[PDB]
Symmetry: C3
Subunit: 596 residues, 3 copies
């Protein structure tokens, strides 16, 4: 009996009944203790003696034994205890070896990480994926991971080790073909990794989430090829209320916070600092196996960001046998800025980027039904490479309403690069254009329409302050076709502008182009006393349907017409009034209109 | 002593002091074990022997005993253990019997559901409410439920059983007259039920919430009369970050995700697929006892939905002695689509529906001060029955700003049905109208104003692409009165339209109607050389205050006026210019304006 | 052995192995029990006998001993047990004494509050701060608090005691110089306090959050000087999904829900009732030590509020050696109302307030790049003191897009008070002005521009119903300079208004002022048959660049011009048509335009 009690079965001989309640189960202490489980229950030598964790102990095999055992009972939650750091010092074996895996996750087995998990220097200059939910080296032959949650106040620390080679991959949690899996509360820090968390695999998975996590300093070297903190690769999944921070120079050029790569995915309520990019919103044809060829219902909302490159990047692409499509996207309520940097010192600053594929192709995309609304964007005045939208690949539609954009360009694409085919670009008059870059725009077009063609598009320019440095508010080169479009420039703050809208190929003459913009025009009247015609001296107004005065008349003896039409020879003409006769000659600011 | 130790009081004789700290309490093992409690502590036969759960064991009485006992000590949290399925196989007794209750919840007693709870086939074809917080068969004589939280990674499974009769009710959690109650984390699945969760009772309750829950496949038969997944019937309560999915055909016709039925309630950040409806936002007079006759401060924001009928349904109604009012509503940031379906195959597709009462009355409602802003809506091109708003009952105000609506109709109501009285309908120019339904609109009016009357309303139509199939952009039948309103049609993409705005009762002539829209007009001049008048051949322009040219002048020898007014006989008239004399006859596209 | 077993070391002699697994650690019961810790482990007399909590027991020393001990082991989570109320009855000692501290928090030591914590009457009429994370009386010499989380279903009750003197301070949780600290789930109630929670100290701290907490009735007396429920004084921190309620009259005059006082801070998804104010968004120079002199990336989104004063208050100020700046702010998606009250009975109602500093100075502020978008605001018709913006101090920019404001004023500042210098105030046409206050505006200007100067501003007024009671839609006194601005009044619902826009100093004549608004003008023609001029009888139109008819022509024999320009003497002039000759005299409603 003494022997039984001191034995490992002792607690199984000590009776217990909850709160002395006579209606409660007559149990043994061991039954109640068996209701919970921790790493300490597996962190022992072959004789069953507990092993203290530390920098010289590899905890991997013990944590794997705990997970495997709990898995065998239909699941539960293993605690990783507070007040200790648990080092990992070797790779795992079996199915996860193909993924450079350390720990293998299993279905229904949750991890409550309250202490710290820290990679030992065995992993320096090596690939690794700390937690892996695949059960096979080939993800295509992998089983699923279901009902696996990682949560707590603890920490995953990547030991500060740099990558050994750019081709290597490193990850924190790869859930795999993951259904109802989540990470909540955890801080991931101090590394050089590719991703912190990945959700799903090529569309297989569902209901995976990352909530209230922190990601701190996860890129640190020039070796690191690329980094996206959370890659969402299964539908009905997302990231909310997270914090992302980088301090490395390299992060400003390579790091993105989130990738939304399947339908019905979201990125909300998060704060980003020190990253190149905010989010990719993409349908890769190569990733279309699990959930189809369409990324739709994509939501980026209510985030706060300081970045160095582009906030949201839109794209879709193709393989030999699959074509990716991106549609039904909303980007709203975000407040974003380009951090303090030299012009051209990081990838081109943008709120929205329509990005060419990984091979640089701009003629594979199928991006449409995007709404960008109620966001703020700001870039410091020196950052020439800042745009509301860098439209660098084919676009089948994007709508901008009620944003506030305060940067160098509104619409931009580099000339002599790609020549995008643009459809259904809508820029509503309710987009407010800020003045931070006023006086910086010598030689530049606010809306620089460097495309192959534009159709079914609306650009309603409204200034809110003067910028007389700019070459034009909007310019179309002669190589850009323009049809079935509406282009207007409001006259406010434009009286002293030489050029307002510029159509280098006279594209505003098109049958279904509807335009209006201010221009200065010289007119000369006949000498007749009374009602008298005034005609423009130049003949380039054959496209104008009406025009009206934007200038006061300093004269007593006559007045020019208030309104004008045109004539077949391209003159404007209207009827004014000579109180006394005489040939008149005036220079007037007019609002030129065509079909509006 | 051996006997004491092996007895149920044994743990109460084994001393313990935390971490051997001499300043800590000298306790017994049983005291520490008594800090927590699980179902295992009550899941026992009359001799105190533990009973294993399973499909042949009814766990109800044991779980009730646990709840009752914990309640007696001022509360706590009972764990429903992971790795087991706990079947429920009988109804409860007492107060919850009137609600077909299984388990009775009690104040301060939380349930941490980590395992699975599953209904046994005793419940097939029967009503049931799994967890009930009422303590009396008559909710009016019920006490309150306070401080009751249900949370964890577990599951409530409704066993797949169909309803027996349409008149039956089924629910997961009925909190009752519920104050500071919540459900977090739980998956509700595999049923045919009326609701999964209900919060409050006829306005009694407060601070009830449903967060990070999943609701999967909860309608499965033609017997089911109706389904709303969460019914919010107490103020200061809401639903956030939930997932809702249905696969049944019947769900596309009967199921709604959320009902917000009292003031200061919200539905946010959620994803919906396979449902008929997104949310009801309603003040039922019959439900006004607990929190007054007004539903105000109602918020539907940042949701993602694929539905088959209507996204938000607005309503209010009356009883013999109470009148319901709905006001101060915001609908923002939502991205919604009608899923792939045949036209007319499910209830009429809509972003907003102003719905008649349960008896079909359209003259009881008092709905006003609604803001719909920054949402996206899409319906596939074949779905004739798709509208931004189906305005089917009296409306005292609704404001639309900066949305993107891509469907068949903008404003719709069926002719020869209800004749709503409309006030303060505001459709701002910043609403972008998509082109998916271009070419599908033969015989149809984009804004089909099938009302009794319209007052104090604004409709600013702006197209962003051509649709020459439509009969008109906006049409008022002669039975619709129109007064103190502004109606405009921007000219862009309208040059080839026969009809733009149509006023079948010539209602645009009204003293306080402010309109503008394009029209083609034939004019004929006098023969006089010089300044010469042009007059319209038709006499239907007595209401026009000015008009201006939207056409170029192909002539050298003359020009028509740029601008026109009218004359008492209903002609337009303006002054053009004959370089050489002669009677002129032209057909010109004009922008007709009245008081704008 | 019997003796050992009954001793405090007994559990350390009883063997245990998890679930009888031969691969598990051979432990003792005490090891498993040592995995968790509660207040009961420290709530004991000097002989180690447990003490029951209650109104006559001071639990403070015991809870401090628990925290100190857990801190010594590298942290963990102490449970404050459910089913008991734990009273605090004395002040703490050491570093927190300077802060009137009760309990001292320590790094990595979390509190899981499931029971109730309640202040005893020792604290009546006294200052107190219940939980304090500073370790020194002087916050400047304090160490940090890291990784401290307070969570659970429990309650902190302040005992209902009033303040003794207005100069006293009271707080719930002062995290101090706080990094990765949070409060989740807790209800704070029944007090008269200054704050419930404060985060950070003068910019020192990071990643502090308050989530899913309730704050109920925390002001109760006329003695209380001021109250803000959560004060956020460190960056990368915020408040989400909280509930705030007050019932006291005094709260309607003194209480604010949140203060956002450092960069990258947020307030989201919360509900407020009974408060004076929603949120301060402020950069105090005096608080600039820890995180710099700029508050930027400030976010107030998706809140629901009933308040009595101002929803968001913007400000910045200076000290002898530091200047505060506020920029890059977003206010979106909020639905707010002024609760039922008499006019002038609480501080002036406002959605946005640009507030002078604590000394009343209006010439210290540097507030710019603010976006206010997609919000709703409502005040009952009797509340004269209600404005979309009360602009009472210097403003360097604020942008309003796509809001719905239904109150007395749109833009307001009291005349004969402060004279703000205003730059970059942008009021887009997409702001919808409600009609609740129609007919209440005798003697009042909808936009009452009571400033020193206005520059680089846009005000686009659009009515949606008639209000003929108002004196004007917009008025500039002669003391307000106006330059490089755009001011328009849409004609809809304005035909019967005497005054639309009023420029008491004729400021619309300015070279870079762009305006348009309706006016009635009397004209007289020459007698000539045919094309004939009409001239205004008054000479105050020297600033007008064009005008056009907003009136029908009731005549057959002639028509006035459709469009007009001006003449140097300030007449308008245009060319109409006399079918028969004769001098004509008409009164016409025109749209007057200047440079637009
Ligand atoms: C770091 C990052 O996320 N970058 C984005 C680009 O992603 C792509 O490059 C990545 C570089 O790391 C990834 O490729 C790498 O990893 C692949 C997967 O690893 C294998 O399979 C795993 C399941 C195993 O555990 C591993 O052991 C290994 O076997 C590997 O095949 C590639 O060779 C390697 O370079 C990334 O690949 C994806 O990763 C996720 C997450 O782990 C996984 O779920 C997917 O299965 C996998 N996809 C594929 C196809 O294998 C790869 O996608 C990304 O392409 C780019 C988006 O922008 C560009 O394209 C847009 C659309 O055309 C265009 O709009 C834009 O302008 C372009 O810049 O963004 C980041 O750069
Ligand atoms: C399924 C659903 O939610 N449908 C919505 C309509 O709700 C209404 O019909 C429901 C059908 O199930 C409910 O009625 C049923 O249940 C009633 C309540 O059950 C009793 O009381 C419970 C507390 C007990 O536990 C039960 O044992 C039982 O005793 C019952 O009285 C009815 O006879 C039965 O048909 C629903 O009733 C409400 O349910 C909630 C949640 O449980 C409860 O808190 C309320 O007390 C209770 N209300 C009432 C009045 O009893 C009943 O409301 C809903 O009316 C409709 C809204 O849209 C229509 O009306 C709008 C406003 O005029 C209009 O804009 C719109 O166009 C219309 O379609 O939406 C769903 O159909
Ligand atoms: C109640 C509230 O929050 N009111 C807002 C104003 O805040 C300011 O007044 C408060 C009155 O309580 C605070 O001052 C009081 O407390 C100070 C701090 O206490 C000391 O230091 C603590 C760390 C210790 O634990 C204490 O023991 C004590 O030693 C004290 O120095 C003052 O004497 C006392 O009156 C508040 O002070 C701040 O509090 C936070 C939170 O605890 C702390 O992190 C800060 O260190 C501390 N700040 C300073 C400078 O010490 C003090 O800021 C607030 O000023 C006002 C904002 O609006 C006005 O100014 C705007 C900007 O110009 C302008 O736009 C607007 O129109 C103005 O009305 O809002 C509330 O009234
Ligand atoms: Na691999
Ligand atoms: Na769109
Ligand atoms: Na081209
Ligand atoms: Na009943
Ligand atoms: Na409204
Ligand atoms: Na009628
Ligand atoms: Na102090
Ligand atoms: Na702004
Ligand atoms: Na002045």
């Amino acid at each position: 009996f003494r022997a039984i009690i001191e034995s490992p079965e002792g607690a199984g001989h000590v009776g217990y009944q909850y709160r002395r309640n006579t209606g409660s189960t007559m149990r043994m202490v061991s039954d109640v203790l068996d209701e919970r489980v921790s790493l300490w229950d597996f962190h022992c030598d072959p004789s069953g003696n507990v092993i203290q964790p530390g920098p010289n102990v590899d905890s991997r095999q013990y944590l794997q034994a705990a997970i495997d055992y709990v898995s065998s009972n239909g699941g539960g939650t293993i605690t990783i205890p507070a007040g200790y750091t648990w080092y990992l010092g070797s790779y795992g074996v079996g199915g996860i070896a193909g993924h450079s895996g350390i720990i293998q996750l299993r279905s229904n087995v949750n991890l409550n990480i309250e202490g710290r998990i820290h990679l030992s220097p065995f992993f320096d200059l090596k690939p690794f994926q700390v937690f892996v939910g695949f059960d096979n080296g080939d993800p295509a032959s992998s089983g699923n991971l279901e009902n696996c949650h990682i949560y707590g106040h603890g920490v995953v620390d990547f030991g500060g080790y740099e990558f050994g080679a750019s081709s290597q991959l490193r990850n924190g949690v790869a859930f795999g073909r993951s259904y109802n899996c989540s990470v909540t509360g955890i801080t991931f820090q101090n590394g050089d990794v590719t991703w912190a968390i990945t959700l799903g695999w090529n569309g297989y998975g569902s209901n995976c989430y990352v909530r209230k996590c922190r990601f701190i300093n996860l890129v640190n070297s020039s070796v690191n090829a690329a980094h996206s903190t959370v890659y969402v690769n299964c539908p009905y999944s997302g990231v909310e209320s997270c914090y992302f921070s980088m301090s490395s120079s390299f992060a400003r050029n390579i790091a993105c916070s989130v990738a939304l790569h399947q339908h019905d995915t979201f990125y909300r309520g998060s704060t980003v600092n020190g990253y190149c990019r905010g989010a990719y919103v993409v349908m890769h044809a190569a990733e279309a196996a699990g959930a189809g060829s369409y990324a739709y219902n994509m939501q980026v909302e209510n985030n706060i960001a300081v970045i160095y490159g582009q906030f949201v990047i839109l794209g879709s692409d193709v393989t030999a046998t699959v074509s990716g499509h991106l549609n039904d996207v909303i980007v709203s309520g975000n407040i974003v800025s380009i951090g303090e940097r030299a012009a051209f010192s990081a990838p081109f600053g943008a709120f929205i980027d329509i990005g060419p594929d990984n091979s640089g192709a701009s003629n594979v995309q199928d991006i449409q039904r995007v709404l960008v609304t109620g966001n703020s964007f700001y870039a410091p005045a020196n950052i020439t490479d800042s745009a509301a939208i860098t439209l660098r690949a084919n676009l089948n539609g994007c709508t901008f309403i009620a944003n506030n954009f305060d940067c160098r360009y509104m619409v931009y694409n580099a000339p002599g690069t790609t020549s995008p085919v643009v459809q259904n670009l809508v820029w509503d008059k309710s987009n407010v254009i800020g003045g931070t870059h006023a006086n910086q725009r010598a030689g530049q077009n606010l809306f620089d329409m460097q495309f192959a063609s534009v159709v079914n598009s609306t650009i309603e320019v409204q200034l809110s302050c003067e910028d007389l440095s700019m070459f034009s508010c909007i310019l179309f080169p002669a190589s850009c076709q323009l049809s079935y479009s509406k282009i207007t420039v409001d006259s406010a703050w434009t009286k002293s502008m030489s050029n307002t809208a510029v159509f280098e190929g006279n594209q505003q003459a098109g049958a279904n182009v509807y335009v209006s913009y201010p221009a200065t025009v010289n007119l000369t009247s006949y000498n007749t006393q009374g009602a008298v015609p005034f005609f423009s001296t130049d003949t380039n107004y054959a496209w104008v349907t009406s025009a009206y005065s934007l200038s006061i008349n300093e004269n007593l003896d006559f007045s020019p017409p208030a309104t004008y039409t045109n004539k077949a020879n391209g003159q404007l003409v209207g009827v004014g009034y000579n109180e006394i006769g005489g040939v008149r000659s005036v220079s007037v600011r007019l609002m030129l209109q065509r079909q509006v």
